[PDB]
Short mmCIF file of N, CA and C in Angstrom, two decimals:
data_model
loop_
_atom_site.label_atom_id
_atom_site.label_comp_id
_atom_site.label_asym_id
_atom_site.label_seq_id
_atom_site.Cartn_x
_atom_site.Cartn_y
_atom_site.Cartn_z
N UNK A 1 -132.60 -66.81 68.94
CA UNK A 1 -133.82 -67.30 69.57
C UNK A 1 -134.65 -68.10 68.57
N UNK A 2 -135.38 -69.37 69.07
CA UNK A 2 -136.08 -69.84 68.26
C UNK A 2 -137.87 -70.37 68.99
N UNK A 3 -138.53 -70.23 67.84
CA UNK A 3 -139.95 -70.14 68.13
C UNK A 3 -140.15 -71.26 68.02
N UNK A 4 -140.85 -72.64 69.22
CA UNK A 4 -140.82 -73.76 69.89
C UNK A 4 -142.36 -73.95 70.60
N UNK A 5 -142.92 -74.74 69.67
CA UNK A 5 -144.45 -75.40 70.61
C UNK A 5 -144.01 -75.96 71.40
N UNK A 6 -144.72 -75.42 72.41
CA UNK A 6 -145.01 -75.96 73.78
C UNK A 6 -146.32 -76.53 74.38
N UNK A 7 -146.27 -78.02 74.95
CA UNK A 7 -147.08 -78.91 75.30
C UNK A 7 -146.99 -78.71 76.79
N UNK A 8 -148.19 -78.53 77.14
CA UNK A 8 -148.41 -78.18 78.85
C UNK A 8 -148.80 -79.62 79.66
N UNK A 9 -147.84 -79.67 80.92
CA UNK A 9 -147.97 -80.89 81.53
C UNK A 9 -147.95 -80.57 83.01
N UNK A 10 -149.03 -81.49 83.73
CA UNK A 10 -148.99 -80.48 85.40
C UNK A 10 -147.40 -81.58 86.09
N UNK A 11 -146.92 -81.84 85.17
CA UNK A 11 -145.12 -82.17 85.68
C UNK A 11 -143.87 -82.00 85.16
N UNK A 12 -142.70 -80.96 85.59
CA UNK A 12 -141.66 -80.97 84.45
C UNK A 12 -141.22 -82.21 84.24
N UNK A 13 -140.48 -82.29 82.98
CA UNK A 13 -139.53 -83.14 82.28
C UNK A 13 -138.20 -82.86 82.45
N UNK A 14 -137.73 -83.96 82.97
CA UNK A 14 -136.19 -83.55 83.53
C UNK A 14 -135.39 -84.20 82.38
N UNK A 15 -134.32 -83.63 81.94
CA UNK A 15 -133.19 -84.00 81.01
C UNK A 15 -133.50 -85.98 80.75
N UNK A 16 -133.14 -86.32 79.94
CA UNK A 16 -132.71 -87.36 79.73
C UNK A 16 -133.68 -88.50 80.53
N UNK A 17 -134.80 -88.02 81.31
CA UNK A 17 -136.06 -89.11 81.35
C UNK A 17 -137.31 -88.70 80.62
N UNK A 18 -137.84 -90.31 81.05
CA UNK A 18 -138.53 -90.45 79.91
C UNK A 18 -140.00 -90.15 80.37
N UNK A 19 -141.01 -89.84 79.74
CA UNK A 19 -142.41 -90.13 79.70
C UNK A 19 -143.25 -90.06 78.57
N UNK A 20 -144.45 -90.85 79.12
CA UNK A 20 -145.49 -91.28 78.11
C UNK A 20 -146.93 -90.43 77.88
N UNK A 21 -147.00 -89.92 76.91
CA UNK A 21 -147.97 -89.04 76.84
C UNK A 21 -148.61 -89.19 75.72
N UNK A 22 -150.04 -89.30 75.80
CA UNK A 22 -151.36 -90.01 75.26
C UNK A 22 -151.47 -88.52 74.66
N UNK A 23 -151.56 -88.29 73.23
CA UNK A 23 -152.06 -87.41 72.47
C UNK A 23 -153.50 -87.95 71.83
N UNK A 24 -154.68 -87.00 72.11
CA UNK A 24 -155.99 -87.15 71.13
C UNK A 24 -157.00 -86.16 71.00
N UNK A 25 -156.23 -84.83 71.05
CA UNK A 25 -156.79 -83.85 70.90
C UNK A 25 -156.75 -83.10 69.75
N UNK A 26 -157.65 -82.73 69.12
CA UNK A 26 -157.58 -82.28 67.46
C UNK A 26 -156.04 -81.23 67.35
N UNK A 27 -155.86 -80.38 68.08
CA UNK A 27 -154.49 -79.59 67.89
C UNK A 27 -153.18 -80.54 68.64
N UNK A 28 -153.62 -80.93 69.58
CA UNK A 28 -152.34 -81.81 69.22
C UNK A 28 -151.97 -82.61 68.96
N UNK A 29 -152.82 -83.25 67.96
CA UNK A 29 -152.15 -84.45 67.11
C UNK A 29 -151.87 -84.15 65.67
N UNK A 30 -152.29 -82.46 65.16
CA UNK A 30 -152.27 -82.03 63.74
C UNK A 30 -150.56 -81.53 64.13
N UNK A 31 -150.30 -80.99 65.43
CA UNK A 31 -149.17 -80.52 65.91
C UNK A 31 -147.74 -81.77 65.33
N UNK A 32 -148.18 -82.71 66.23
CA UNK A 32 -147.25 -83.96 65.84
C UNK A 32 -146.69 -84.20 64.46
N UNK A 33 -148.37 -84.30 63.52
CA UNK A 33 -148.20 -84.77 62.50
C UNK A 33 -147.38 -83.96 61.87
N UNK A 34 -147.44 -82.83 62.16
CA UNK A 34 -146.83 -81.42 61.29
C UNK A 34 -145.17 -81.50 61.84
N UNK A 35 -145.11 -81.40 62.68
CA UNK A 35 -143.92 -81.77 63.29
C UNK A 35 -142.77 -82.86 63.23
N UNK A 36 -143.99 -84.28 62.99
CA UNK A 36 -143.12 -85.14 62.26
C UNK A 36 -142.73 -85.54 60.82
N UNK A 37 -143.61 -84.47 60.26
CA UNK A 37 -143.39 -84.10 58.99
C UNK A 37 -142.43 -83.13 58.70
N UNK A 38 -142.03 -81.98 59.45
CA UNK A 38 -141.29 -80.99 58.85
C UNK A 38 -139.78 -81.46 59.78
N UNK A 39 -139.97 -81.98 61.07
CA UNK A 39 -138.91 -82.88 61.77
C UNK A 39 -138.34 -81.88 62.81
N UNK A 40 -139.18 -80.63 63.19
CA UNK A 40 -138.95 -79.36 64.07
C UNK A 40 -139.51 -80.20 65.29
N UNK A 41 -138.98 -80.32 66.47
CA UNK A 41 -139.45 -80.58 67.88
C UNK A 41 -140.18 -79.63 68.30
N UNK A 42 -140.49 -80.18 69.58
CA UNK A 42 -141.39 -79.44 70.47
C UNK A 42 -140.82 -79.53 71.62
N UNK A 43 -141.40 -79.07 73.00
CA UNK A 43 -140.99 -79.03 74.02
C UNK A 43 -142.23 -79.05 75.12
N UNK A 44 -141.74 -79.30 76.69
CA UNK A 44 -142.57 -79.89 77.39
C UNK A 44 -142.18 -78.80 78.65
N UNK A 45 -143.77 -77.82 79.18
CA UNK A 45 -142.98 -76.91 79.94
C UNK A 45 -144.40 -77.10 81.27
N UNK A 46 -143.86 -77.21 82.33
CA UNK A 46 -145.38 -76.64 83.76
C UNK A 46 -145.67 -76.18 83.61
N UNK A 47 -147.05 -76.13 83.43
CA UNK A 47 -147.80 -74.95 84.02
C UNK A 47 -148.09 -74.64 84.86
N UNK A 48 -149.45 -73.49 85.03
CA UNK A 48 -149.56 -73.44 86.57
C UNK A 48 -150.90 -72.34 86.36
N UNK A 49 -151.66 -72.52 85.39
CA UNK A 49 -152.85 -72.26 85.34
C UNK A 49 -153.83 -72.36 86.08
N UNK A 50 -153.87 -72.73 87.67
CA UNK A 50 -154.99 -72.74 88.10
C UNK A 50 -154.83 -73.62 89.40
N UNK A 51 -150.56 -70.37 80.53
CA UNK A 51 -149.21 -69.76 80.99
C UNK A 51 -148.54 -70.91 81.34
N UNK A 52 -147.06 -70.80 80.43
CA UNK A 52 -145.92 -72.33 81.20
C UNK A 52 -145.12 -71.20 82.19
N UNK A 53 -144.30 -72.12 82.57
CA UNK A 53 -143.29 -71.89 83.25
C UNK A 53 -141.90 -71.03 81.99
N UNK A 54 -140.93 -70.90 83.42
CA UNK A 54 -139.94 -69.90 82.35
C UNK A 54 -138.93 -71.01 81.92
N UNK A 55 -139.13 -72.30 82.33
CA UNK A 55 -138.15 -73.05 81.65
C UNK A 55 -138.89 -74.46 81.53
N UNK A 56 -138.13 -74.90 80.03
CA UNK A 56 -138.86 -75.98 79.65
C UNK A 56 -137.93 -77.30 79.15
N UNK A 57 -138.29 -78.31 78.61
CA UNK A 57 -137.29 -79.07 78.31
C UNK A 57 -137.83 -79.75 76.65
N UNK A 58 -136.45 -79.76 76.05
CA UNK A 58 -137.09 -80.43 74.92
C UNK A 58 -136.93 -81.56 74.61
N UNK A 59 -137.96 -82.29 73.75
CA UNK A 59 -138.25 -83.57 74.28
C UNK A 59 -137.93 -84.07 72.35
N UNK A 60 -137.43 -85.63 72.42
CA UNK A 60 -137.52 -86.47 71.47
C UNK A 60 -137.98 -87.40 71.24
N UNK A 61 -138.71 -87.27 70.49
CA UNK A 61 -140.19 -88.64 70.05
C UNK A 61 -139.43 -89.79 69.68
N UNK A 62 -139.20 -90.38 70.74
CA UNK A 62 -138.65 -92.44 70.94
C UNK A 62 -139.37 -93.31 70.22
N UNK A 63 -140.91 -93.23 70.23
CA UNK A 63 -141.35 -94.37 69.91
C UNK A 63 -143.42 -93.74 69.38
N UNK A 64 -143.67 -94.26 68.45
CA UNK A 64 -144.98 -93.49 68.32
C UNK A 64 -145.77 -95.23 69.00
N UNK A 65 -147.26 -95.34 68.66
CA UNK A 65 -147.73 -96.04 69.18
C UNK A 65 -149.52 -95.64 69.72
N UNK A 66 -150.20 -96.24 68.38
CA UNK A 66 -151.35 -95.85 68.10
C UNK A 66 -152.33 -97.60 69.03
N UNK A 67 -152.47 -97.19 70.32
CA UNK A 67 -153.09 -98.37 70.62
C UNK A 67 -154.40 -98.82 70.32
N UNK A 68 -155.08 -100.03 70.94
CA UNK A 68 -156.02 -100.96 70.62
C UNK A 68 -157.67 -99.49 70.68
N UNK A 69 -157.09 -98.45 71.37
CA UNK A 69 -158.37 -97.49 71.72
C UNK A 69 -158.13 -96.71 70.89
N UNK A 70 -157.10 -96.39 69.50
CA UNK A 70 -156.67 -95.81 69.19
C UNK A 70 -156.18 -94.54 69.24
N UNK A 71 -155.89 -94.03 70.43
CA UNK A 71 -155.30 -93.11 71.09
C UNK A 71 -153.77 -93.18 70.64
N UNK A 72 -152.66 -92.10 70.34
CA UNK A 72 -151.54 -92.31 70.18
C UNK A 72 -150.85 -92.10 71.20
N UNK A 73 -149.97 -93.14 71.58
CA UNK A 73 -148.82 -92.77 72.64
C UNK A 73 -147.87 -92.29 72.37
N UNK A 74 -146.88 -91.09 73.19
CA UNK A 74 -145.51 -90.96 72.42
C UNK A 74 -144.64 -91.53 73.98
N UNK A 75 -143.82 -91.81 73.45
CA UNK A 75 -142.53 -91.97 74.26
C UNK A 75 -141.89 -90.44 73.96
N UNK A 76 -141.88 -89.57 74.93
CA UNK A 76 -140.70 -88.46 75.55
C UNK A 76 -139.61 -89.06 75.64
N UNK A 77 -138.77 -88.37 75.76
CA UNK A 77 -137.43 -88.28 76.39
C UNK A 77 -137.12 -87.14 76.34
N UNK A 78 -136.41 -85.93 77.43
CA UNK A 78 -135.71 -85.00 77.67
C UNK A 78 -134.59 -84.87 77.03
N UNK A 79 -134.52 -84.03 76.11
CA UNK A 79 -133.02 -83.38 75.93
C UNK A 79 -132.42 -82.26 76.22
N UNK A 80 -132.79 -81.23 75.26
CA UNK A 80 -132.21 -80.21 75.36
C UNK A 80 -133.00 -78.72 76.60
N UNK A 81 -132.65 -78.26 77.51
CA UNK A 81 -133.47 -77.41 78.71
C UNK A 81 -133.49 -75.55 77.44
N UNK A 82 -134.61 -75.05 77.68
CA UNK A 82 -134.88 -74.10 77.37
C UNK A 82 -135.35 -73.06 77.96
N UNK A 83 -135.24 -71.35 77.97
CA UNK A 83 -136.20 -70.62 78.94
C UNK A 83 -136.83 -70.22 78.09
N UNK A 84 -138.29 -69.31 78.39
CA UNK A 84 -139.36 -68.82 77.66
C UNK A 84 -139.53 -67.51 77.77
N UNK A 85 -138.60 -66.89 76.61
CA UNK A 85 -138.51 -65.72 76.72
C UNK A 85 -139.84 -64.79 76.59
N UNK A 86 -140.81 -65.30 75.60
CA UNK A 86 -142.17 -64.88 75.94
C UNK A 86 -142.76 -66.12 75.03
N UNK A 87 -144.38 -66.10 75.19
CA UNK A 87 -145.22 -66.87 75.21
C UNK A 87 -146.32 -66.35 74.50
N UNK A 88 -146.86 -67.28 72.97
CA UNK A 88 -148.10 -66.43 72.96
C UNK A 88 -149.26 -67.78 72.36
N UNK A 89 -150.50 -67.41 72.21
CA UNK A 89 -151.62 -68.46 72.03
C UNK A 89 -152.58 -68.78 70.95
N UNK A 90 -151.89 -69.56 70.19
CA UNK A 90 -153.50 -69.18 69.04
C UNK A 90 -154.80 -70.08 69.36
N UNK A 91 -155.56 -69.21 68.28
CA UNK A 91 -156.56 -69.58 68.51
C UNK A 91 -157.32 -71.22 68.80
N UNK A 92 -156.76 -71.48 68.52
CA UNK A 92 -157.21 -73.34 68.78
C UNK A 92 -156.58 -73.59 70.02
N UNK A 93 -155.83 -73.26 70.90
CA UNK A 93 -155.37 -73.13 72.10
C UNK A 93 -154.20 -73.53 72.02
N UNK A 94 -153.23 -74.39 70.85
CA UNK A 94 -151.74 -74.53 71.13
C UNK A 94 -150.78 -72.94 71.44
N UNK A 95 -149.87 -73.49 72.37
CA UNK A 95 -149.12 -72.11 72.81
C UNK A 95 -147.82 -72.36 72.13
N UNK A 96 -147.10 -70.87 71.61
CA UNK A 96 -146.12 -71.44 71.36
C UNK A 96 -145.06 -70.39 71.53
N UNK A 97 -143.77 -70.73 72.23
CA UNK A 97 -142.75 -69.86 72.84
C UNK A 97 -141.52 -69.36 72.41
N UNK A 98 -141.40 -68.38 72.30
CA UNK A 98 -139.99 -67.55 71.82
C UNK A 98 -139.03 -68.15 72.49
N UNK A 99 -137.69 -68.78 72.33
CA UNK A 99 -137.18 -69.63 73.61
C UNK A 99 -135.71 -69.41 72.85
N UNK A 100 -134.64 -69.29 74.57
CA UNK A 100 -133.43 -69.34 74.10
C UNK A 100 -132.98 -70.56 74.80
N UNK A 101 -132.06 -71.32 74.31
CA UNK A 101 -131.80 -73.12 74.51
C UNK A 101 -130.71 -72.37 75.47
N UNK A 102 -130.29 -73.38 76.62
CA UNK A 102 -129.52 -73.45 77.68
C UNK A 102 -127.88 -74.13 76.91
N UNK A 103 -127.13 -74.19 78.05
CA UNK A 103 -125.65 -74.76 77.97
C UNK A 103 -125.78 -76.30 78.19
N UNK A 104 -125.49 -77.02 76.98
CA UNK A 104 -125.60 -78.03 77.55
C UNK A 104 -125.10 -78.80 78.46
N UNK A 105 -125.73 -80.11 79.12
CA UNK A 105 -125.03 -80.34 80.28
C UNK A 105 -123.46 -80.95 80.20
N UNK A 106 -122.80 -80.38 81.27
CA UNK A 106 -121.33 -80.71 80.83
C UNK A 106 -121.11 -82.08 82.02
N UNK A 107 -119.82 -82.43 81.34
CA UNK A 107 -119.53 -83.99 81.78
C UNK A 107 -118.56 -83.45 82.84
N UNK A 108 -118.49 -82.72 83.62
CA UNK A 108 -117.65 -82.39 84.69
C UNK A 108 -117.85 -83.08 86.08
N UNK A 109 -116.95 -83.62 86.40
CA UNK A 109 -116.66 -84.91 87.22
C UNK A 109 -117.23 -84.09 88.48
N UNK A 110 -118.22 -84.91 89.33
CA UNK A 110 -118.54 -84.43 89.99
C UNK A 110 -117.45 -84.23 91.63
N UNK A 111 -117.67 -83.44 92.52
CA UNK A 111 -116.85 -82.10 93.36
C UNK A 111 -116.64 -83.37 94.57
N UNK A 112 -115.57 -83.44 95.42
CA UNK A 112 -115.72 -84.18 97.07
C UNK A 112 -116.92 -84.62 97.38
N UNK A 113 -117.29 -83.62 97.73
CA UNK A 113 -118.61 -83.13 98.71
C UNK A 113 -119.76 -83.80 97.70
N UNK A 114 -119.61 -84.14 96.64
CA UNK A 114 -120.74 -84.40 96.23
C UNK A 114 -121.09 -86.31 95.91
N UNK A 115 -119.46 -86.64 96.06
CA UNK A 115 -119.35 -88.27 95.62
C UNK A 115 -120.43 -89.12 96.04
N UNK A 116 -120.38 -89.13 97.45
CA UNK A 116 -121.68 -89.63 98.31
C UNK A 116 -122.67 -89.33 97.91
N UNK A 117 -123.28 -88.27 97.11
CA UNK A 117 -124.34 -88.49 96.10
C UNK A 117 -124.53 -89.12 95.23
N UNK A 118 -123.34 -89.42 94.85
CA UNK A 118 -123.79 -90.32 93.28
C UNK A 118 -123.91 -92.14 93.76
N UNK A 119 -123.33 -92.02 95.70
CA UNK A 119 -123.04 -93.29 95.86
C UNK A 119 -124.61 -93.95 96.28
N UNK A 120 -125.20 -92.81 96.99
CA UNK A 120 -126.95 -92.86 96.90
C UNK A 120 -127.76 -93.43 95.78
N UNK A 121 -127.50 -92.95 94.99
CA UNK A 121 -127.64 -93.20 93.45
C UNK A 121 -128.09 -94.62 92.85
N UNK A 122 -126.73 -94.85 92.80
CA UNK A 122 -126.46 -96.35 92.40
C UNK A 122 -127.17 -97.54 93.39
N UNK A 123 -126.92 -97.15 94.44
CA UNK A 123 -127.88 -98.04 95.34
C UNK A 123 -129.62 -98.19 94.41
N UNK A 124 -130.04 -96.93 94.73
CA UNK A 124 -131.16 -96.77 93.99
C UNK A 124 -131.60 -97.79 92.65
N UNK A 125 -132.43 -98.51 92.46
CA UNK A 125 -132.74 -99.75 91.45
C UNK A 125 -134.03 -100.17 91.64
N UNK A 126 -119.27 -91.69 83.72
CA UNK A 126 -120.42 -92.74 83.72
C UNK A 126 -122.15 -92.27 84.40
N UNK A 127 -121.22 -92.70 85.63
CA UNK A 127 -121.58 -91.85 86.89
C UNK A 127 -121.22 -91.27 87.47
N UNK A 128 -119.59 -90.69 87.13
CA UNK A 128 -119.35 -89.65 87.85
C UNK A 128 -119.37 -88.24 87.04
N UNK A 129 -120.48 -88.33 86.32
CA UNK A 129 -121.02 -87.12 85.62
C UNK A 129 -121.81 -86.45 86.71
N UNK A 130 -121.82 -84.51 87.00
CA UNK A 130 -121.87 -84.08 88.14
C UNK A 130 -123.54 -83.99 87.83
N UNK A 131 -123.79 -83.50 86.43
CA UNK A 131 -125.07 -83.17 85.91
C UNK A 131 -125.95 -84.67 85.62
N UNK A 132 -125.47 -85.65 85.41
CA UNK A 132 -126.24 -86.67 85.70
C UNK A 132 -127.00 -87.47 86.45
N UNK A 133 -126.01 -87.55 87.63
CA UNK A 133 -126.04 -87.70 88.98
C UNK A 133 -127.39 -87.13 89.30
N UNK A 134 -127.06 -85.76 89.10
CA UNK A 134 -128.33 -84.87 89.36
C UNK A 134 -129.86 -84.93 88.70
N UNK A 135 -129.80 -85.28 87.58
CA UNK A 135 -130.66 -85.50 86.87
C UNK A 135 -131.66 -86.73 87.36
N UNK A 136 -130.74 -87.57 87.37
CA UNK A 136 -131.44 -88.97 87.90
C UNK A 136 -131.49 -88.49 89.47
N UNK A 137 -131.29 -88.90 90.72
CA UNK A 137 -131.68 -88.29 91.49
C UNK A 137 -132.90 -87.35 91.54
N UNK A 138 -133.05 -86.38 91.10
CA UNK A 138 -134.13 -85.58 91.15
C UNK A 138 -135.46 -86.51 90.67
N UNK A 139 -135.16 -87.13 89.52
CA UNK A 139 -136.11 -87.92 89.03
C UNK A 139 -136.75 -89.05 89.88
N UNK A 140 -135.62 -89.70 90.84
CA UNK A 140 -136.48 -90.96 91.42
C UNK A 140 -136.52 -90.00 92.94
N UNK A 141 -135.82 -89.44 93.50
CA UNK A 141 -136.36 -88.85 94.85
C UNK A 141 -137.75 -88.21 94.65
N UNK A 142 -138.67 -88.31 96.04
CA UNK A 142 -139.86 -87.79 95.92
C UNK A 142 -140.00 -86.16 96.10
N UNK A 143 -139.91 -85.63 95.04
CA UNK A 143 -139.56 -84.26 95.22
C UNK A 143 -140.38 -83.48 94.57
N UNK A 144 -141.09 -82.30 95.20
CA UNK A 144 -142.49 -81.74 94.64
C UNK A 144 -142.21 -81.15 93.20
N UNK A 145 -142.83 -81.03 92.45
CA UNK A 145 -142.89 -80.36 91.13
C UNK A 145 -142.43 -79.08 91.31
N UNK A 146 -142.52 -78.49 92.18
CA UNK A 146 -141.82 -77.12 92.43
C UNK A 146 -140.21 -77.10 92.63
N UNK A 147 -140.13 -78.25 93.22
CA UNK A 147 -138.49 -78.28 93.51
C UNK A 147 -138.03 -79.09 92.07
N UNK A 148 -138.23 -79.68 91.36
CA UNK A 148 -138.57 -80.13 90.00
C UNK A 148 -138.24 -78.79 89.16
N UNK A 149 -138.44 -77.88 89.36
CA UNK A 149 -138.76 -77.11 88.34
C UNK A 149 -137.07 -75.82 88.63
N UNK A 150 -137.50 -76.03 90.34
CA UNK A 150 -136.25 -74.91 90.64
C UNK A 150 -134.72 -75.74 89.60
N UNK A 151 -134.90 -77.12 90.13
CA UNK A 151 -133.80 -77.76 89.57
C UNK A 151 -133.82 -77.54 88.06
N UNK A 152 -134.63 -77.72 87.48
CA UNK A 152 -134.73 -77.55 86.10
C UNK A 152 -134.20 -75.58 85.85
N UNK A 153 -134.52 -75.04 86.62
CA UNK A 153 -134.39 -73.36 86.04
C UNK A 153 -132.68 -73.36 86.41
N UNK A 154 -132.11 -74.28 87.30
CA UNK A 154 -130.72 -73.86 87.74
C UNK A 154 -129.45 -74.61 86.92
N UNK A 155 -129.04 -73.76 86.07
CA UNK A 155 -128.44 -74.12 85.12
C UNK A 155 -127.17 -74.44 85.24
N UNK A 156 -126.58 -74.81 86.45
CA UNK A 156 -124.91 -75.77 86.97
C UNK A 156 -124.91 -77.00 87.62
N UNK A 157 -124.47 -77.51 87.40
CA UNK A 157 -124.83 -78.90 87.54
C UNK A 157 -124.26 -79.02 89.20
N UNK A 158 -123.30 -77.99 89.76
CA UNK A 158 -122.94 -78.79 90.89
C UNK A 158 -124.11 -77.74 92.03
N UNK A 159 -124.07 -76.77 91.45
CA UNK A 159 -125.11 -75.85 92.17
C UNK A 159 -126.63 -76.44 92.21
N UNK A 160 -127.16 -77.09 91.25
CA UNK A 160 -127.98 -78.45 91.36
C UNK A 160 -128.16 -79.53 91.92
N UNK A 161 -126.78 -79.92 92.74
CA UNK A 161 -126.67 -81.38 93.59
C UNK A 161 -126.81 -80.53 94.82
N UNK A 162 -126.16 -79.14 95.07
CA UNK A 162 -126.01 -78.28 96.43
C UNK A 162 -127.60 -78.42 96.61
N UNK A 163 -128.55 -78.15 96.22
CA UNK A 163 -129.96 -77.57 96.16
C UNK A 163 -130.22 -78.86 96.66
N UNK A 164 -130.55 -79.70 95.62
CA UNK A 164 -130.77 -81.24 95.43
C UNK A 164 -130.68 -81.92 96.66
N UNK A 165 -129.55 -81.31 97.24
CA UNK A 165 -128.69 -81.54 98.75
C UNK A 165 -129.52 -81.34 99.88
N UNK A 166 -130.37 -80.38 99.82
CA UNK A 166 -131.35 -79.82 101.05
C UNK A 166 -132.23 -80.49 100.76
N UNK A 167 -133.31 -80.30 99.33
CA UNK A 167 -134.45 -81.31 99.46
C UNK A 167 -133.91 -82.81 99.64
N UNK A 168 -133.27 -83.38 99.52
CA UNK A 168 -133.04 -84.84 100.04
C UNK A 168 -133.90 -85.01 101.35
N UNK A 169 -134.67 -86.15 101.67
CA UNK A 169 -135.13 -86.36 102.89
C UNK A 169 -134.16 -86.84 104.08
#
């Protein structure tokens, strides 16, 4: 198990997309700096305060980017999925989580039943990765943060397109 800051966002981070997140808060930008100094990641988990969620994703700093307001931007990207085995808070309010890292996603060709998903897909604007498919999909379909998150806690990639399968509109 390894002990992993966690950055609270009212949206999960799904594998392998990206987002932009404006750091300018005294703890989390000493967080960064410390972080991009010692070269330990962080991770990006829901909350639901109003405590993360039990699974999170970890994220790799793409691109820094201190703009004209001088606010810093980071470029996210999703990598590696994690659960939160427990959670605790210091005093300046960063949280930070006991976490065991998931299986990573495997390149297993996706099932019959599922081809016509990936053919959805591509329309949308290799691929017959079963966990990819899925990944993207979830990301551009309009799908609530809750179903976001189930997908994120369900750790098989074809049992992910099955799910994926019902929320589809």
């Amino acid at each position: 198990i390894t002990s992993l800051p966690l950055f609270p966002l009212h949206s999960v981070l799904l594998p392998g997309a990206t987002i932009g997140l404006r750091v300018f808060e005294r703890r989390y930008l000493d967080l960064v700096r410390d972080c991009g100094r010692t070269g330990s990641s962080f991770g990006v988990c829901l909350i639901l305060d109003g405590v993360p969620a039990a699974y999170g994703t970890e994220v790799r700093i793409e691109d820094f980017d201190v703009g004209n307001d001088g606010v810093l931007v980071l470029r996210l990207r999703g990598t590696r999925r994690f659960r939160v085995q427990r959670s605790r808070v210091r005093d300046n309010g960063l949280v930070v989580g006991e976490v065991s890292w998931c299986e990573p996603d495997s390149d297993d060709e996706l099932r019959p039943e599922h081809g016509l998903l990936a053919t959805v897909l591509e329309r949308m604007l290799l691929l017959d990765q079963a966990a990819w498919v899925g990944w993207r999909l979830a990301e551009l379909l309009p799908l609530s943060e809750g179903q976001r998150l189930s997908l994120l806690q369900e750790d098989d990639p074809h049992r992910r397109l099955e799910q994926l399968l019902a929320w589809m509109p």
